Design a protein around this nucleic acid. Sequence first.
RNA 1: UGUUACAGUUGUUCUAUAUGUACCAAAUAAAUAUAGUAAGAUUAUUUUAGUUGAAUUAAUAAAUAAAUAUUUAUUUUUCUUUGU
Lengths: 101, 187, 227, 173, 346, 442, 142, 56, 121
Amino acid sequence: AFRRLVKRHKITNNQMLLMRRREPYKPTMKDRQEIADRAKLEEFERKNADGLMFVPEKALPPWQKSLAHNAKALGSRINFRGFRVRVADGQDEPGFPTPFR
Amino acid sequence: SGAFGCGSYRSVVAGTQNVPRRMTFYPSAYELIQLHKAHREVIRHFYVRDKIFDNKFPGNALANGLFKFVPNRRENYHMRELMESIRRRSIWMHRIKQQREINAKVVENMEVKYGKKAAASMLCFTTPDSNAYFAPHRYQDVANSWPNYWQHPSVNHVVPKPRWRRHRELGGITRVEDPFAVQASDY
Amino acid sequence: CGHNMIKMGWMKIGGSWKYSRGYNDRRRVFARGQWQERKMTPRFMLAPRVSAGGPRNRYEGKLVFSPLRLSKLLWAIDTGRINPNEVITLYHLRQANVVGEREIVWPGFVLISNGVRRVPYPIHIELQNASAESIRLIEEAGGSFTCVYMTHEGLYQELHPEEYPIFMDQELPERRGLESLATNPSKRGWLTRWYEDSSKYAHPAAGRRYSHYLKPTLLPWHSYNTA
Amino acid sequence: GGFTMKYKKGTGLWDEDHVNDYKTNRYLSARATMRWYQEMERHQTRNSLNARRATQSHNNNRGLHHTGRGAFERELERRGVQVEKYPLTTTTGTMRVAELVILRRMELEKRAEEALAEQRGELQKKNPTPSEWYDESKGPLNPNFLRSMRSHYEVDIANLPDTPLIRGQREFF
Amino acid sequence: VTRLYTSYYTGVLYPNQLVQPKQRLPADVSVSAILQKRSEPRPYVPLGEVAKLELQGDYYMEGGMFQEALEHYGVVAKAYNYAYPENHAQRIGIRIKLSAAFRQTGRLESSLANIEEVLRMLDASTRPSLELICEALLELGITREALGMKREATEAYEEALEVVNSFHNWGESHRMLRLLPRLGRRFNYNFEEKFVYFSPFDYDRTFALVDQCLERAETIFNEIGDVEGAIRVLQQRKEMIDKKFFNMRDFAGRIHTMRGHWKRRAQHLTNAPTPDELLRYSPTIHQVHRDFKYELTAPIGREKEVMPGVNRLVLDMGNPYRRRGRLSNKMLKDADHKFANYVRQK
Amino acid sequence: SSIFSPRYDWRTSGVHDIAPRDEGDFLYQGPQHVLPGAHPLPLHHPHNTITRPVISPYIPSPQRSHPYFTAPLPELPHFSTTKPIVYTYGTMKERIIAPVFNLKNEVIYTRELDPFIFGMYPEVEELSKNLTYWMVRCQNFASKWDYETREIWRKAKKNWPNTGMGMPRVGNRKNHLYTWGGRTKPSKPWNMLMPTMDVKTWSKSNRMMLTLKMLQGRLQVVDRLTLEEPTQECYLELCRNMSWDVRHTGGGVLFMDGGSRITPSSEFDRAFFFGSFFNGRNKIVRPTVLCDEQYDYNKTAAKQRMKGPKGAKNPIPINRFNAYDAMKHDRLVITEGALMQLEDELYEHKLQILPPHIRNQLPEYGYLDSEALGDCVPSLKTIQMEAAARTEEAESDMYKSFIDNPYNPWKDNMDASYAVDGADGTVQKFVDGKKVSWSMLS
Amino acid sequence: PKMGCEEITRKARRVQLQPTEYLAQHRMQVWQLRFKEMGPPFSRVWVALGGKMRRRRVGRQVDVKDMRYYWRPIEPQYQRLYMSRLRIRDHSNKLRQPMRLRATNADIGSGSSSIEWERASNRKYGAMLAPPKRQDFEFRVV
Amino acid sequence: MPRPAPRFAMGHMLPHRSNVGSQFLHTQRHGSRSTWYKKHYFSLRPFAIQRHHGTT
Amino acid sequence: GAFTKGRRPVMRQKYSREALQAALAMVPPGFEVADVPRPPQRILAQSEGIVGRWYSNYWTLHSMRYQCLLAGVEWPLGERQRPRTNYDEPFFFADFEESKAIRDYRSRWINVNRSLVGMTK
RNA sequence: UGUUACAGUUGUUCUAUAUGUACCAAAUAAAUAUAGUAAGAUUAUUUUAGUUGAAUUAAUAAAUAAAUAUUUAUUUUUCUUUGU
Ligand SMILES: NC(=O)c1ccc[n+]([C@@H]2O[C@H](COP(=O)([O-])OP(=O)(O)OC[C@H]3O[C@@H](n4cnc5c(N)ncnc54)[C@H](O)[C@@H]3O)[C@@H](O)[C@H]2O)c1
Ligand SMILES: [Mg+2]
Ligand SMILES: [Mg+2]
Ligand SMILES: [Mg+2]
Ligand SMILES: [Mg+2]
């Protein structure tokens, strides 16, 4: 499903009449798809180089923040240390030791 | 009725002790503006209620003595709009009079605590930019607040001063003697 | 001056039409797009329902208040819109134009202390369902809050007092409102004292409890006495 | 039928207010303007008179007075007591108020023009020649304004030279 | 596609390349008269090759090789004196450069002699260039301050200022460069076309010359200890740069991306009236001469000054209802007589 | 045609006769030759002080901020504004003083103008909003009718089978393809739209237009607009004495009749209003720049039998001041009563526009002295408004013995007692053990 | 059509002003039952509760600890479609944000805070939102 | 300014029904032409004959 | 809303204090407000003003009751409902219409106190 | 030869064919009633910027569909280049 009406370009050099592709130095469609996949995978690996940093309740996505806050506001109203609520949702376990942990 | 600044029947039933309040000076400028416009509204309501027919054309000159409102609609208008506006004006007057009494008390306390001139200087609401709104000829040398900034005496040097002269042969027309400048026209 | 023919751009009038049927299906409300439905079911069909009304369902009398910033109230007071010498109510807010009529929907408002950690002066305000932190701030400053949880008729009468020449019997709030805000001592409800008063349970003649205003014309035409 | 703001219809200061007029033109001649005023007054008067006629006819058909009052109010009027709670001002009262206001305005205008003529005589006797305003330092004067102000001075004001006469440059007259 | 510009790329045609004329002194006023009122209180010559030589000479002068610049200037000045008649613009300009080279080499007496000869040639000229006279007396002032005549140098700088404030047009340099930001139709890319800027130090060389004159005057005044003169010169310099900026001022048109409408550049690129000429020839101060001999309308009293006609009969006013029935014609009955009595003669 | 077109310069000969006519044509003498009409600036209306004379102390100059007086003249009596002067964000920040003209074409005295009214510096976008609204509104909407396919009166039956004869496939053939059929989306008066104008923008644009007239110098203030007789010849004699070119071709006149300075009124003078009906370029408008808030009681097409354009059902009346009429009519004549009415109607607007730290200084400086509270004698008003005020003052005596007195509402509010009867489920008000509150019916 | 055509000389059915659609016609109950709209103004996400909804025989999925109650945002293309259905109203106004999933206090207030509702004492300040008042004790019908 | 008045509905353009156009754009009637003197595409404009359109 | 009495007045005549007293004199001695019941919903809420036998009209009776309260006129008739605060004579009543036992002040006073106590949030 | 009775939901007294006024889904009057919608037309030159065969996992805690088009956003190093 590509453009059947070919784009027209102002011909400044007579070799533009011969060239079919607009940017010949640009990789082909599937080649640049593979290139983008590889680059995004490398960026993701760089981002996950360090372990999964556990995050407090305020820096949570909206669909978890208020749930986790309400699940323990009752116990937080009474100031005493060592109270934990085992909420179902939240960050998952990494499975290995982490410097942030 | 919470319309006045005293409190509502709900607060009365609750028994909240809000009677002794901190008397702070309050000029009630917004309230005075609202009272002005409410007074104008009441006068306009009376006018539109007392409007009677006065037709200038013979086809309509048959009912030149009657009210433009039918009696029923005139009564309904007087019963709703006119007296609701009067009640709103009365509410504004009551609030402003209460605040004036409190302000008089505060002024008396400040005068007996510091002195007349000290209390007046402490109660004065003068801002260093009040001239920009009340007397801009005293604020010209402070900042350029003109919509036509090029004519401000600080930036007035940019406006050109042509050499005009009247020509009797053209009918008293004023014409500038400055010769035009040649323009770039080709390249 | 042109046609925004999809996947082609802004084409010129009288130009080529042979390569646009999506533009015709955009003009005419007829639509397609089964490329995602050919195999998998839609997300609204896959997701279950948490309740018969749905999440955040605004059922009748849900007590959905519009927020009122304590910072906004303090800003209005410091500006000069609101007189702190008097008891501030929703009528006073609306008259000082602190809130627009667009925002006023039953139940009235909630005082939220967003961006304020200290109130400098005592403020006596009447609202509904103020936050515990804002109530604490006002009390520490020295003011007083009263959770005046009123019905719809009471709200309309408080917002339009001139339409009522005399005081009229105002009904008590509903059961949910009575148990939540009116008789709640934490919210400083306006009926907590009446609810705690036990002299009304003894005899039906002793059920009524009187209350008085606590204690410490308007003609525009004045006589020309200055001479 | 349907809902229409009858509570706003007729509330403006003039007859043209609160009228849905969508048959106008960007330029109206003398006849067009006369007909526009005629149609506004006619709309108002027809509305009022038709409402009055319908109300009076309905009351008469129901058997009451043309104002809708009954036997109780008729007997009250016979005894001489006031029937309505709030007797509003009548046409005679409104016209009398307008008349007395206009008469006070006329008297004030007489006294004001007397005092103003006195002050103008004093000012013209004091100042024979124009003041600082009669200068061309920033631009030319206006011959129309000069011919309107000629009657205030002894010297010829409208007679302007071709040179931009300046106050401090050359003594005028 | 990006452009590497490896091959030869022909330049583009842009309105900033318009051939700007030279500001000329009026024929009546003379530089000699200005100096007096201040004191009161062709044969064939290989001009291409001599232009190469003069360019090399000014390159030497800019690089700091003053003796070589001086000898190049001498050769090209001999060539120009042979090729041009007496009191010519290029002749006086090249001897300006020659006096500058003399002063830089240290022959201050000969530099002053040459610059005085330049001044007398400017006086003899009919309509000399403002840039030429300003640069000439700027070189005069620099030579005077090198000799030790600081008061005379300041006098020369001040006379530069008083000439450029009385005969130079501050808006003509950016007449065709002021509406250029309205050509840009793209906001995400190529958006520098909406912010194209042209420095006045490149399109008004008289402005830069007078700016340097005032800078040197302020320096001399600070050295001497004349706070009044320094304040005066700085005020005038600020006023000049403010006039330039004001004549460059303009509001913004469309901000975001516009597709199509390429024929709007005809409206964009025009002789747009600069702020200076607008405020000068405002239609109220510089009024338009309007003769009623070529018109069909005139004031109430001047009825007979209209364009004449043969057998003119005033029928009536063109009352569009006269085409209607007898009742309309009866309604339009006395209007003609009343109009006649309204426009009657005094 | 377009300039970038081949057909632009394809006329090569025949445009001009080589022979010049011996009556008007002339030759160019040179630079000193003063050509009639030639001007450096593009002037689509090249007028001067003779064709379109300005009525102001000075000719509008770039060295002057406005072509009027900046200080009161010592030989003319000066009258300040009816309301105090305050400089908002858009005002000219300079004193504006204009001469008041007598009906004998003489300057009797001078009067201060309000910068908020005649000092709001004009802006092209606001003036364009005003003009566009006025034109779109003044269009006639009843003539926007057109036929639809369902309004063609043809048989609701296929004329011929699609495959039978060589004719094309068609059915009712009452559509737009045929010369007798109608369109599917025709023009309808109820489908057309009438724009909505807010009071803020309307007032701002009107004050900008007034300021533009003042800057151009075509504003003239007179004391009265009265005629000895209500006839047209008296009006034309007044115009001839005042040099008002009310001809269809001359610079038209726009009157704003608001009455005298001592006697202002919201109604036009009867004699002048009857005399001003003349077939020329003259228009009289109401002494106001504000407008009523526009509404729309058919925003969702609930009433289907509505005949009229969508949008505001309360458009601006024709006799109101507007940018179109101000541009069409050269001179703008305004009365002192109209000035007073404009000031009285814009006072509270500019006070609410004011910033808070300046608003708190208004009672300090004395800009909020309300006569309703007894701190000043009442201010001057129009005839009708003073009549309404006197009527109110007289009728106020009937609200004394009644508890519904609007001049003293809820007077027994502090002295009463409130009782929460839970069996009745209500809070009631009592005075001396008697229920003074009222239970609403139904 | 033509000026004197027989098609227009004779009368026919006359078209009237068409009625408009419901203002909230394009918001559906399926969305309000399934998802909810969360997040800041320009980062709104429609979230639906996760898990595999399935009705099986008795004896399967005994351990309730696996079935977790949690909300996860729906696919962005479906969210865009559902938001466009709300954008349908007032298409030409580019300065108008899309309609919300659940009505807010501001919308319920704007429903009657206009100029054409200033006199309607009823249907003001959430009349239908508020609970009903007590009827008369002698209330009856025929 | 809430939705300023449309420039196309200003009464200065009564154009032929085109492909694009707003619901509030008043186009020319069906069967009627936009320009009055253009009987054909080659019809000339009358020299001194002026047809007053719009206002009186 | 325009048929029944909802937020809408039904008698537009507003009489003076003397006209209020003159309209109360024509009421026969022995009449009580509790005698006239509230008409049902399907009955149009209207008031013919002060006519013969006007006290029989429920809407005219209470509309005049409110006008006498504003003008400060002593209302000669009784209250619409008399509250039972103490246990006095009669110590037993008969009501075949099952309304007196539930509309009693003592019967609804205890039901409110039951609900006020039953709240356990 | 004419006149009677039989009229479409069906009539020619079972069914079928045929036929019921010049194309038997009979003819006349209304319908934008609606076709998962087959197809055909769709008014305006001189232009001013990115990809030309990719993407494709129904369904519990997995970073990301891609192409096309419109608006819009990132001046970080380096020998040059680089549509992210
Ligand atoms: N929903 C409501 O009931 C509602 C709403 C707004 C205002 N009000 C006000 O409440 C009051 C009583 O309402 P209600 O339902 O009990 O009765 P109502 O309004 O149905 O009837 C009141 C009766 O007293 C008369 N009346 C009203 N105002 C009067 C006045 N100022 N002076 C003299 N006579 C007057 C009326 O014409 C009528 O005869 C009235 O003032 C009314 O305007 C009621
Ligand atoms: Mg629902
Ligand atoms: Mg829906
Ligand atoms: Mg059969
Ligand atoms: Mg893209």
